[PDB]
Amino acid sequence: MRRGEIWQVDLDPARGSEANNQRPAVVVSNDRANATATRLGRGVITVVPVTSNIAKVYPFQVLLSATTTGLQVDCKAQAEQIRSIATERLLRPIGRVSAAELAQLDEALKLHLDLWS
Amino acid sequence: LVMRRGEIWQVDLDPARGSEANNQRPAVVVSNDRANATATRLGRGVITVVPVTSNIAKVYPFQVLLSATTTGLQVDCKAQAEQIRSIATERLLRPIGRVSAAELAQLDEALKLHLDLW
Amino acid sequence: TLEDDYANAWQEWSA
């Protein structure tokens, strides 16, 4: 379990326009925290949900090509939907994002979370 | 709907699972004011926040202590960057206060560390 | 326009 891995996760129950249902998501917490998650067997890690709707890819979102990741179809990661989840919610590991996709996700996270300064 | 960054609001994180933050807890707005302003003009939207917990017994580097003196919190709480989460604005109950600028920058650094940002 | 992007990102279908 390391950063940039894509796992399937259970975001349910959810409310409003939040990411819902069982979705792929990208590990964005640093490998340090994730390592201690693995040591505890329980814990929280932070991930970015993915969505199928590729009609428009917004600046805070990053496009993942199913070729690169082992995803079933081309999807976009939504930094504006970022959220930390208990490791109970990790169902299965789908794949890994490319290093370029990861860099753009870092950059999208700075944009959405205002981490420029 | 008047959410802006660094503000402390009471929010309903429940239902929750595992070691996640639960119940109706204070939380700090960490999403950028463009999205938040857009939530206000819409009246609906999603924003990102960092929960705080009252259990300030031990504070980790990715956590920042917030002081009840100025923040409008009733007791000193610690913000947990590892509990970061995006929330529908249904979940906002009431506006508590604002974090100090020192606390805000320090949470920025805790978030950069936790998310491996640079 | 980035706020247009946000409004549409939230409202567009996810599931």
Numbering used by the authors:
A (entry chain A): 2 to 118
B (entry chain B): 0 to 117
C (entry chain C): 42 to 56
Sentences from the paper on this structure:
Toxin-antitoxin (TA) systems in prokaryotes are modules composed of a toxin and an antitoxin. All the MazF members are RNases, responsible for the cleavage of all types of RNAs participating in translation.
In terms of the MazEF-mt1 TA system, our previous studies demonstrated that while η1 (Asp59-Arg76) did not bind to the cognate toxin, α3 (Thr42-Gly58) bound with a stronger affinity even greater than that of the full-length antitoxin. η1 was a small helix that follows α3, and the binding of η1 necessitates the conformational opening of the swapped loops (β1–β2) covering the MazF-mt1 dimer interface. Except for the two residues Trp54Ser55, the overall conformation and interactions are maintained in the cocrystal structure, when compared to that of the full-length MazE-mt1 complex. The close-up of the interaction details revealed that the peptide complex is maintained by the interactions on residues Tyr47 and Glu53-Ser55 of the α3-peptide. However, the last three residues of the peptide failed to maintain the helical shape with Trp54 of the antitoxin swinging to the other side. Due to the extra energy needed to pry open this interface, the affinity of the MazF-mt1/MazE-mt1 complex is lower than the MazF-mt1/MazE-mt1 (α3). Interestingly, we found that the 4-nt RNA ACCU occupies the site that α3 binds. The tetranucleotide was probably from the cleaved substrate (the recognition site of MazF-mt1 is CU/ACC with “/” as the cleavage site), and the structure mimics the product-bound stage after the reaction.
